[PDB]
Amino acid sequence: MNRSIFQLWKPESPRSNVNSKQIKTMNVNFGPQHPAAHGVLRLILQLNGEIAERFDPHIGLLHR
Amino acid sequence: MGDAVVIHLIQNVLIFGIIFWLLTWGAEYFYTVKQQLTKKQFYECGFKSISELNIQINFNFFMLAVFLILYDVEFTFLFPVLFNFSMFSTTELFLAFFFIFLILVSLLYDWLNNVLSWSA
Amino acid sequence: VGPLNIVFAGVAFLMFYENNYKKLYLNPRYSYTMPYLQSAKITKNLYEKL
Amino acid sequence: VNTAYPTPLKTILKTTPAFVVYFVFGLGFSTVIYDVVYHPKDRIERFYFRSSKFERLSRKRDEKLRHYFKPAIEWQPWYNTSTNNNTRPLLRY
Amino acid sequence: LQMWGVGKIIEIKKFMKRRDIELKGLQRKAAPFMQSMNDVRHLALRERNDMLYNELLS
Amino acid sequence: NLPWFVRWGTDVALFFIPAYTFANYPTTFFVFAAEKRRQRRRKDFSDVKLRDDAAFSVDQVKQLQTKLHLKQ
Amino acid sequence: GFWIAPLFVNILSLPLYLVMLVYNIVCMLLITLVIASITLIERKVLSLVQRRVGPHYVGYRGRLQYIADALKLFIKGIVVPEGSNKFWFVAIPSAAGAICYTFWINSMWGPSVSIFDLEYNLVYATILSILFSFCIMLTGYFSKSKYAFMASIRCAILMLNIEIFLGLLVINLIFISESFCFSVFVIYQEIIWLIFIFFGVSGLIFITFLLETNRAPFDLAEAESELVTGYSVEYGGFYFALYYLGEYFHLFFFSMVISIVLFGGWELPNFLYLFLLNDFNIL
Amino acid sequence: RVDYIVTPINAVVSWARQGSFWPLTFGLACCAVEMMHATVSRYDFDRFGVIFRATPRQADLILVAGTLTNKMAPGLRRLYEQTLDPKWVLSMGSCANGGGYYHYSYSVVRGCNRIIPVDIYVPGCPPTAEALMFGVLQLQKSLYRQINEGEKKYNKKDLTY
Amino acid sequence: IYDDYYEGFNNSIMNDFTPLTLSYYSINSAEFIIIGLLLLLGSVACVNLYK
Amino acid sequence: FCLLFVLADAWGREKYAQPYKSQILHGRQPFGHTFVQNYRNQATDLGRWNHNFACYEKQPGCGRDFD
Amino acid sequence: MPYFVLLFKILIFCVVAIATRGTLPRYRFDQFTQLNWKHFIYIWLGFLVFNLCFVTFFI
Amino acid sequence: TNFGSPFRNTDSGIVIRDPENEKRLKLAFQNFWKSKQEDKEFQAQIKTAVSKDTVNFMFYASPLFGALLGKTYIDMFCNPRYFYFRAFTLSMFALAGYCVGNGFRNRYEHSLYTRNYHLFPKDLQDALVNGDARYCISWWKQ
Amino acid sequence: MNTKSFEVLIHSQYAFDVCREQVYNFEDCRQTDTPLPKDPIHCKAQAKEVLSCYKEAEKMDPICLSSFNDSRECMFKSDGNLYNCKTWINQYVTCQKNPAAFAEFLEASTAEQLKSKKFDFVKNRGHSDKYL
Amino acid sequence: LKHSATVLREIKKDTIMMILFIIGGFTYCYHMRETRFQLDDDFNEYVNTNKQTFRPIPDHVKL
Numbered sequence A: 001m002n003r004s005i006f007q008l009w010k011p012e013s014p015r016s017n018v019n020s021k022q023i024k025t026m027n028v029n030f031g032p033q034h035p036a037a038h039g040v041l042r043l044i045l046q047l048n049g050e051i052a053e054r055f056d057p058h059i060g061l062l063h064r
Numbered sequence B: 001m002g003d004a005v006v007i008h009l010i011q012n013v014l015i016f017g018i019i020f021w022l023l024t025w026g027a028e029y030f031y032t033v034k035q036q037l038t039k040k041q042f043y044e045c046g047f048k049s050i051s052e053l054n055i056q057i058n059f060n061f062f063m064l065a066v067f068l069i070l071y072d073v074e075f076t077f078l079f080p081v082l083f084n085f086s087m088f089s090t091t092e093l094f095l096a097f098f099f100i101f102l103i104l105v106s107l108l109y110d111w112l113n114n115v116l117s118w119s120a
Numbered sequence C: 001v002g003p004l005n006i007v008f009a010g011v012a013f014l015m016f017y018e019n020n021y022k023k024l025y026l027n028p029r030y031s032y033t034m035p036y037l038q039s040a041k042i043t044k045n046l047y048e049k050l
Numbered sequence D: 001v002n003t004a005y006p007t008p009l010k011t012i013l014k015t016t017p018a019f020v021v022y023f024v025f026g027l028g029f030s031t032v033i034y035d036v037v038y039h040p041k042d043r044i045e046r047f048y049f050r051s052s053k054f055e056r057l058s059r060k061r062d063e064k065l066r067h068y069f070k071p072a073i074e075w076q077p078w079y080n081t082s083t084n085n086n087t088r089p090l091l092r093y
Numbered sequence E: 001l002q003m004w005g006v007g008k009i010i011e012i013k014k015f016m017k018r019r020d021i022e023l024k025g026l027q028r029k030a031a032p033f034m035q036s037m038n039d040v041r042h043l044a045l046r047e048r049n050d051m052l053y054n055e056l057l058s
Numbered sequence F: 001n002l003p004w005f006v007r008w009g010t011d012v013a014l015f016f017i018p019a020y021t022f023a024n025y026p027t028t029f030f031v032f033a034a035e036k037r038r039q040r041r042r043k044d045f046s047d048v049k050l051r052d053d054a055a056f057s058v059d060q061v062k063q064l065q066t067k068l069h070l071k072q
Numbered sequence G: 001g002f003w004i005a006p007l008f009v010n011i012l013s014l015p016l017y018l019v020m021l022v023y024n025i026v027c028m029l030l031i032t033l034v035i036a037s038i039t040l041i042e043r044k045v046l047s048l049v050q051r052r053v054g055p056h057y058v059g060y061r062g063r064l065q066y067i068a069d070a071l072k073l074f075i076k077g078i079v080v081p082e083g084s085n086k087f088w089f090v091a092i093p094s095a096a097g098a099i100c101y102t103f104w105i106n107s108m109w110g111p112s113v114s115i116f117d118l119e120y121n122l123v124y125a126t127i128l129s130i131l132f133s134f135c136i137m138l139t140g141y142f143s144k145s146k147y148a149f150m151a152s153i154r155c156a157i158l159m160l161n162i163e164i165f166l167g168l169l170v171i172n173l174i175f176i177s178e179s180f181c182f183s184v185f186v187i188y189q190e191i192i193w194l195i196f197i198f199f200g201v202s203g204l205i206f207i208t209f210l211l212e213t214n215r216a217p218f219d220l221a222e223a224e225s226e227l228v229t230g231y232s233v234e235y236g237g238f239y240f241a242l243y244y245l246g247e248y249f250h251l252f253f254f255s256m257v258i259s260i261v262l263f264g265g266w267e268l269p270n271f272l273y274l275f276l277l278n279d280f281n282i283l
Numbered sequence H: 001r002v003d004y005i006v007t008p009i010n011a012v013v014s015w016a017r018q019g020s021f022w023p024l025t026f027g028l029a030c031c032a033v034e035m036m037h038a039t040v041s042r043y044d045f046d047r048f049g050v051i052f053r054a055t056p057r058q059a060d061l062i063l064v065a066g067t068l069t070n071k072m073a074p075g076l077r078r079l080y081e082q083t084l085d086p087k088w089v090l091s092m093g094s095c096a097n098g099g100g101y102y103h104y105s106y107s108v109v110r111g112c113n114r115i116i117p118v119d120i121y122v123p124g125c126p127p128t129a130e131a132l133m134f135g136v137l138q139l140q141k142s143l144y145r146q147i148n149e150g151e152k153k154y155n156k157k158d159l160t161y
Numbered sequence I: 001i002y003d004d005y006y007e008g009f010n011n012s013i014m015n016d017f018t019p020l021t022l023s024y025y026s027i028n029s030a031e032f033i034i035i036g037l038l039l040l041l042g043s044v045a046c047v048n049l050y051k
Numbered sequence J: 001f002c003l004l005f006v007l008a009d010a011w012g013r014e015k016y017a018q019p020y021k022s023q024i025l026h027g028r029q030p031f032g033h034t035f036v037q038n039y040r041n042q043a044t045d046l047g048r049w050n051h052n053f054a055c056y057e058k059q060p061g062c063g064r065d066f067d
Numbered sequence K: 001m002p003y004f005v006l007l008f009k010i011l012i013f014c015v016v017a018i019a020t021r022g023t024l025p026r027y028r029f030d031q032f033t034q035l036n037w038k039h040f041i042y043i044w045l046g047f048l049v050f051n052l053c054f055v056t057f058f059i
Numbered sequence L: 001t002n003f004g005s006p007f008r009n010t011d012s013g014i015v016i017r018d019p020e021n022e023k024r025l026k027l028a029f030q031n032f033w034k035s036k037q038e039d040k041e042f043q044a045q046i047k048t049a050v051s052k053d054t055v056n057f058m059f060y061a062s063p064l065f066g067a068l069l070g071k072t073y074i075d076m077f078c079n080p081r082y083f084y085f086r087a088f089t090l091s092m093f094a095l096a097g098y099c100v101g102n103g104f105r106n107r108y109e110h111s112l113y114t115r116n117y118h119l120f121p122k123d124l125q126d127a128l129v130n131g132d133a134r135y136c137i138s139w140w141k142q
Numbered sequence M: 001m002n003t004k005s006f007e008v009l010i011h012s013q014y015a016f017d018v019c020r021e022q023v024y025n026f027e028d029c030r031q032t033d034t035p036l037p038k039d040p041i042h043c044k045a046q047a048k049e050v051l052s053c054y055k056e057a058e059k060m061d062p063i064c065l066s067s068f069n070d071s072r073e074c075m076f077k078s079d080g081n082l083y084n085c086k087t088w089i090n091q092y093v094t095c096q097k098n099p100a101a102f103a104e105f106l107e108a109s110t111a112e113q114l115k116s117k118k119f120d121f122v123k124n125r126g127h128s129d130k131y132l
Numbered sequence N: 001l002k003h004s005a006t007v008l009r010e011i012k013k014d015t016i017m018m019i020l021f022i023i024g025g026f027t028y029c030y031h032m033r034e035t036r037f038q039l040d041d042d043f044n045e046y047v048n049t050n051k052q053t054f055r056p057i058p059d060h061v062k063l
Ligand SMILES: CCCCCCCCCCCCCCCCCC(=O)OC[C@H](COP(=O)([O-])OCC[N+](C)(C)C)OC(=O)CCCCCCCCCCCCCCCCC
Pocket: B010, G087, G091, G092, G094, G095, G096, G098, G099, G102, G131, G134, G135, G138
């Protein structure tokens, strides 16, 4: 194949609109009531076209 | 392709949906719904959703969509010769093979430039 | 009701009755277009009055 | 002597009630479709496009004569309905 | 298997073509009388129209 | 007393024979009516034109068909 | 009477329309029962694969499981989320139910044995599939749930591949039959099934069959493990029942289409005795 | 005279809802593991029609099987509220019943009955798959009987008014 | 109502794609090839626009 | 490769009789195609047209009917 | 009537689909889109060309 | 049969299963062949795509060629201690050869009763085309 | 002129052998250099002559009634497919050409051939029927 | 993969058998097409039996 690195990653430059996230990120949570979350994980998942971009795993929902 | 009989059958399907609606109402007789704060709110695995109307996708496959349009058009163009291939001649055979070759060439060019995958 | 409403009802009834009358009595009744008014017999010749 | 069923046969046989009820319902549906098609024609009318052009002309010639030729050859200026609910042309233009 | 199946399908189509030749012969035997009936009915409906036009336009 | 395949044969037969008959006769209890309609569709001698220079008269044809046991 | 007869033409034609409606309702009820039996069959077969009994205490030995499921989905209450558009939230399931009950009109059960004289059965199947895909997408969007919307996007991505795959399969199929009608496919399959020609792309045929029926490995837009439930995250009761019925209707009728166009249609397997079969019987 | 119709239809509705009892795929802990064990081949809930649905909209039963923490109680309450009616609640395990091992903890609700109403309790820790199946079957029997428990009295003609 | 039975029995056509074939593959074949080249060049231009 | 093989076979089929030579190199199309593509055509020069049997007089087996 | 054998074949295909659902894992949308638009579309087009060539071989 | 008779649709709308008619037709054509068996000119007029010797050689050699191919296949690829599969493969190859030979013979019969169709009398031609032996009663009665 | 289409087809299959001169004259009159048909007004006399000869050829022998009925049933169930009914049509035309010879034809029948002919083109389909 | 001598011999066996099988299949397809030609010839001979009449186009039809 040929190079496709520029299509693979997108960096952010200061005050650069093109390099910034020009989209409202789908900040859905992989919450407890989810078959793949084992029921006690609230993974705040920032997605960009279903691509896992940011992770905020809220644990301690089973902390006893 | 059908006719007014197909239209009347669509009407009959609507009437069948009316029958299902009657059954659902009769079932609605058999329970009570109590108003609650989060009962009629969005479900996001047990916690309130932080977005209501602004749920935007990234749409990284617009190249795939436009290629789908073009290649669906090409397949529609290919349909007539295959429907009447028994009467093919030198001209028709050459045109069909050249058209399929052009489709293959377009696909191969799409592959070479890595536009058939997801982008960031 | 109303005068023009009664006039409309009369004209509509006249249209309905005239259309049905010309369908029934001024027509070669060889094609089955009006059920229960034309006969349901099975024909043998090409032109049989239904 | 125990003449019981083979175990694989038993295991696959605890689905045959569902298979039989599916077959009953499907046969009922197909038979109802067949009878709905059959009753008006007293037969299973082969599709119009499944016939050669001469066959197509021969099949509908009687319908043409009974529905269009006789009204056209026995036509009188006072036979047409005064409204716009006349007979549609064979080729809609 | 693909080549053999294409050959078999072509054989079936050629057999259907032979049957079509026979059917076309039968239809040709049936052609002149149906055409005569159609022409007679067509000219009968044209004579009435010609008479109507000649009466109206005179 | 009875082998498993004989005992299994009874159930598959009970599934197949009624289903096969029902598939073979979609117009249940109306095949007789269809036969009567087919018989009534057959044109008789009065319904058709007969040549005057006929080798066999109508009575001769009827007697021949009766002799041959032709079900028609 | 000579003067009373004209008034009765239309009111006498009306019972014929009522009879047609009754026949169509009966056909829809029968095909719905077929779909319910298919659901029970799926439960029993998954029970066989997973070494379990399956439905056994609804009815006697689990005979009325599908009836119980349908009636329960009837009885289940439905509330529309107040942040969602009520009109679309109720209309899209209704449109899906109307479209999914148009599948049986595009079905052949013999030579010219179908409710209508549809010459373009493949075109009709494509149109109905696209309409149901529209319904799935709008179901995902108007529920305003993120998981449901992602399921709708996955459904849209499937139709990008579904369209190409099914169109190329039809392109390769109509090249032999030279017609969109299903009977024309069957007339060429009396000697050998068309799967023999397409044996080299039998894997692709399997892919297409599992892709148009949205079964595994193409069970996308459902994604039980990934997206919670599918497009029906916010839908319960008979809306979810309609979506399930649409899925199973598509499965049943595309299985019928595949059987007709590739596996002999309604012909017994004659290739098993192909070596012992003659070509012609002359004299 | 409307009681002539509803009572047979009452029985039909109860049979339908007990024959398609769909619980929510929501588990928390060791109790959730035992709940998963109560679905697989050895103890088949599909025999009684109990198949798990991933969303509370399509679930009739809320099976609280695990420890409920103060960080999770609003979540459980929202899940119960968003479940479409009619709905029943099964508290499986000592944590769900009354706190269990962690009753004296700073971050444990000490029972899910403090947050949502509980219809039936299964006591074990963890309850065996047989115990969970017993609880589910008892709940199904009760909800079948709950549609007509004899609340309406009988007049002189033995028809409920 | 006029039917040409001689042309009917001399006609072996069994589908409505005959004018489409006679157009895209007999007379308008030049425009058929032009549309193919147009779609190829359009795909190339779409790739370049994405880049 | 298959295209080259079938072209070579088609050019090798010239040894057969006219009805069985390759259709790639010999057009065999319905009567409408035959009439329109050969009308006033001096390259083929097929003569007059048999209206009843839909063929040119110089084409083999034209006007063949029952004895 | 033919619909009996047709129903048999339909049931066989439905059982096959159910078994495949119970058997296979789930693809990804990106994975299957890459597979279809880089491998399977070419397979379909090549098979079509092969069928055309074989038909021209057999006329 | 895969294609049935080339003169009719074998079972178009009604299944005719009369064994006596087939026996009468076969006897009639056998009598016709015997009657002109000593006619040198008629035998010279008989034409067929494939000769009888070639047809017999193919019918008795294609099964043998198939059997040899199957033996080669089971020696090259099959473990020599698995009788069931080895015998099944050999039988399948032999049956493929027999299919080729039987196709040769059936095509010979087809060419025999179509190329020489113009040498039969009118009644025999009608009986062959329509499959009804009643068209020629003088060839099978006595 | 008052005969249904399929019966016209059968009577024409018979009559083509006896209306040969009239058919030839009509066909010569309607010939042209284009597939477009000639104006029927030029061929009216020949068409009427063909119709007269055909009407004279529609008077079947009484013994041919059974064969004509069998052909009618076959054409009805087959929806006008002549090839699927060429056997019964040939039987009818052989009856018409020589009735007494057809009496001998009928006398030498078998038990299966003496049974009533019931046609079902869905249950029985034939071998490689393009028009089905 | 460093295949043994036995594995290499098996690979050679199967590739040679595949090539021979393909060649035999092509030859049999040639034979099948020739048999189809023979069947067409036979049917043409049958169907052109009582169809030896060729009617000339009338002189009123111009070139
Ligand atoms: C949001 C739209 C996105 C693009 C959609 C592209 C086309 C998609 C087609 C697939 C189906 C879509 C849903 C269909 C049902 C809703 C119709 C609709 O949109 O109505 C809007 C219209 C207009 O909606 P409105 O009232 O909100 O619009 C007013 C205009 N605004 C608000 C902008 C000021 O709705 C109505 O008219 C409501 C009453 C009539 C409803 C008729 C449909 C009901 C369902 C019947 C069965 C339909 C399927 C039949 C199948 C037959 C066999 C194939």
